[PDB]
């Protein structure tokens, strides 16, 4: 009944901002996004819970999301390392769609980005799946405290996570 949605919080130097959730096409990608459900509630035990960003570029994209811990899992696959690509029936739309940035060839991975601009010229190499349910108003704020080069005037941190519904 209905697709599972996950919420996310955006922090800035310890100060809260808002809340952004993603519907996620668990039906279009019954595999890659099928694991994210467990890596979003910390149920797998590997969940990072309280991470940050790596790079931010206002005008092109953002990228910089992982969950590498001392344990021994790292950012890649919740049930292994890499997995073949299921499909990309999902078209490239929206100024900030959800997908993933990995090697490309049979390696969906866990890496992902935000994207503040329409960049449908990346698809074809990775498996796209996701979107901006609600809270986009925040996705813009973070795209103003950064810097056109890599470094960010501020620092994005996570507070809590899990399943919206």
From Swiss-Prot:
Main location: cytoplasm
Modified residues annotated as N6-acetyllysine in this record: 28, 44, 76, 82, 125, 131, 133
PROSITE patterns: CSA_PPIASE_1, CSA_PPIASE_2
Glycosylation sites: 108
Result for mutant: residue 126 to A: Loss of peptidyl-prolyl cis-trans isomerase activity and interaction with HCV NS5A. Loss of ability to stimulate MAPK/ERK phosphorylation
Post-translational modifications reported in the UniProt record: Acetylation at Lys-125 markedly inhibits catalysis of cis to trans isomerization and stabilizes cis rather than trans forms of the HIV-1 capsid. PPIA acetylation also antagonizes the immunosuppressive effects of cyclosporine by inhibiting the sequential steps of cyclosporine binding and calcineurin inhibition. Acetylation at Lys-125 favors its interaction with TARDBP.
Known outcome of mutating residue 121 to E: Loss of peptidyl-prolyl cis-trans isomerase activity
Keyword Cell inner membrane recorded: no
Catalytic activity field: [protein]-peptidylproline (omega=180) = [protein]-peptidylproline (omega=0)
Function: Catalyzes the cis-trans isomerization of proline imidic peptide bonds in oligopeptides. Exerts a strong chemotactic effect on leukocytes partly through activation of one of its membrane receptors BSG/CD147, initiating a signaling cascade that culminates in MAPK/ERK activation. Activates endothelial cells (ECs) in a pro-inflammatory manner by stimulating activation of NF-kappa-B and ERK, JNK and p38 MAP-kinases and by inducing expression of adhesion molecules including SELE and VCAM1. (Microbial infection) May act as a mediator between human SARS coronavirus nucleoprotein and BSG/CD147 in the process of invasion of host cells by the virus.
Protein name per the record: Peptidyl-prolyl cis-trans isomerase A
């Amino acid at each position: 009944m209905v697709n599972p949605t996950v919420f996310f919080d955006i922090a800035v130097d310890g100060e809260p901002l808002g809340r952004v959730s993603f519907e996620l096409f668990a039906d279009k990608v019954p595999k890659t996004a099928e694991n994210f459900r467990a890596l979003s509630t910390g149920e797998k035990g590997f969940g990072y819970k309280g991470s940050c960003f790596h790079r931010i570029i206002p005008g092109f994209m953002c990228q910089g999301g992982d969950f590498t811990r001392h344990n021994g899992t790292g950012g890649k696959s919740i049930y292994g390392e890499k997995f073949e690509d299921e499909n990309f029936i999902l078209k490239h739309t929206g100024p900030g769609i959800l997908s993933m940035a990995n090697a490309g060839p049979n390696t969906n991975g866990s890496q992902f980005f935000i994207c503040t601009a329409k960049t449908e010229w990346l698809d074809g190499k990775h498996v796209v799946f996701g979107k901006v349910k609600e809270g986009m108003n925040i996705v813009e704020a973070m795209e103003r405290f950064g810097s056109r080069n890599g470094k960010t005037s501020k620092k994005i941190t996570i507070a809590d996570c899990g399943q919206l519904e």
